[PDB]
Amino acid sequence: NPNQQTEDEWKFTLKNAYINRDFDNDALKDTGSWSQAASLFYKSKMHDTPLVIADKPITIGADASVQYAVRLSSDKHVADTVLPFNKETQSQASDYLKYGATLKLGYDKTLLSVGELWLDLPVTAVDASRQLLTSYWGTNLKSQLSDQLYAEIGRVEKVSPRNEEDFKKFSFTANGITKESDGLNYIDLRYQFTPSLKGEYYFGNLEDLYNKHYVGLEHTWKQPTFALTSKFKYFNAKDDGNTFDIDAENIGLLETVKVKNHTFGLGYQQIIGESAYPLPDGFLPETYFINWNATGFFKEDEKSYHVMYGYDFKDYIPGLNAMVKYVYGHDFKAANGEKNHETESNVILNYAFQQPLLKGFALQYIRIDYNVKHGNDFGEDRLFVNYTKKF
């Protein structure tokens, strides 16, 4: 619950990150970097003030963060989407620094936060896919209004993307023209219908860009020998006032089964309307899609078919797991108006080291292969050496 932290929590991390996107076509330029980062995250316990109102204290705390990465590879003079890029000089940054702080005020099962926010929502999610992590600046209010109903409202004025140093306004870009928003006003509601069924409704008013509705329902069927996870997801995006002609729905179904150490998933997604499904500038991923991945399958009219196989190797090699995903998308058009289709495969290998000497170290390798009938084919490698210590 939201006003419930009794102890300070610190997190120290290290990340050595190699990302390489290689276009099949020789005419295009390969992107990426090699970087080393160090970071520290602090979250205070909630402290009892001397004001008690109906047997509950008013509470105060604070949070703060700092993240720092150095580029190690040589300058490719093209954007990678990992580290900042100076577009004028055409230079990848040689290093970048993020920091933030947050004021907290709590009462009973409510927590008001002002400053840096780590959001885990539609539009504003966790983005840990590259080097440093996206955060947000604004005010929000969270409450466990009952055993079954959780609510949260907020106004988010600024975003600091994963590859940038500063907090800036949200924006949307089309046809090489950029417009900014004064803010995102949102509500998110999470209802536990039964032990096996829950739902989420979200509404986001991204001022002067677009308004977004999301309904998510998730059911978990537990059996003696397997567990089946069913998800239905509905998104609706429409422009706020005018400027863009955003007109899109994204409907999705995912079914995932865990048996002993195996995982198998199938999904389907469809985009409907007169536009592609929109994402804000600055690579903000939509993590509540059934399968957020490298390319997204969110193009206008696009239907996609998703398959997933996973093995957790704890019985042969502890700390090792692997996951393979394959998506095919069709019924969208290229820019020339020609019928298009595309595929994306992912391979994800995780190894957490088990020797006590090496506690908190892990390795991760990610392989992406994208292909498209009209467009640019590529292969991407991502290799991470991670260290995490929690105290």
Residue 23: contacted member of Ca ion, ligand C8E, none (CB under 5 to 8 Å, by partner type): Ca ion
Smallest separation (angstroms) from ligand C8E to the CB of 217:
5
Smallest separation (angstroms) from Ca ion to the CB of 334:
10
Q: Looking only at residues 241 through 280 of this chain, which bind ligand C8E when binding is defined by CB under 6 A?
A: 253
Q: If binding is defined by CB under 6 A, does position 198 make contact with ligand C8E?
A: no
- What's the Cα-to-Cα distance from 241 to each of 158, 245, 273, rounded to whole Å? 21, 9, 18
Smallest separation (angstroms) from ligand C8E to the CB of 199:
8
Pick one of 94, 149, 173, 221: the residue that binds ligand C8E (CB under 6 A). Answer: 221
Two structure tokens written together for 130: 């590259």
Q: How many residues bind Ca ion (CB under 5 A)?
A: 5
Nearer to Ca ion, 114 or 372 (CB): 372
| Number of other residues whose CB lies within 10 A of the CB of residue 98 | 23
Q: Looking only at residues 350 through 379 of this chain, which bind ligand C8E when binding is defined by CB under 6 A?
A: none
Interacting stretch for ligand C8E, rule CB under 6 A, among 35-43, 84-92, 190-198, 352-360?
Answer: 190-198
| Site string (155-174) toward ligand C8E, x via CB under 6 A | --------------------
Question: Is 30 marked within a binding site?
Answer: yes
Pick one of 103, 197, 257, 348: the residue that binds ligand C8E (CB under 6 A). Answer: 197
* Distance in angstroms (rounded) separating the CA atoms of residues 156 and 158: 6
List b or e across 197-221, with b for residues whose CB sees 16 or more CB atoms inside 10 angstroms: ebebbbbbbbbbbbbbebebbbeee
Two structure tokens written together for 206: 């991204």
- DSSP string for 230-292: EEEEEEEEEESSSSS--EEEEEEEEEEEEETTEEEEEEEEEEESSSPPP--TTT---TTSTT-
> How crowded is the C-beta side of 302, counted as CA atoms within 13 Å?
23
Interacting stretch for Ca ion, rule CB under 5 A, among 23-31, 109-117, 240-248, 312-320?
Answer: 23-31
Pick one of 232, 311, 326, 387: the residue that binds ligand C8E (CB under 6 A). Answer: 232
Q: Which residues contact 223 (CB under 8 A, 6 or more apart)?
A: none
Residue 194: contacted member of ligand C8E, Ca ion, none (CB under 5 to 8 Å, by partner type): ligand C8E
Question: Is 147 marked within a binding site?
Answer: no
Question: Is residue 309 a contact partner of residue 263, using CB atoms and an 8 Å limit?
Answer: yes
Question: Is 75 marked within a binding site?
Answer: no
For the chain, give percent helix, strand, coil, nearest 5: 0, 60, 40
Question: Is 106 marked within a binding site?
Answer: no
Nearer to Ca ion, 95 or 377 (CB): 377
Taking Cα atoms as reference points, which of 218, 217, 215 lies closest to residue 235? 215
Question: Is 377 marked within a binding site?
Answer: yes
Question: In the complex, which residues of this chain contact ligand C8E (CB under 6 A)?
Answer: 194-197, 217, 219, 221, 230, 232, 253
Q: Return binding residues for Ca(2+).
A: 22-23, 30, 372, 375, 377
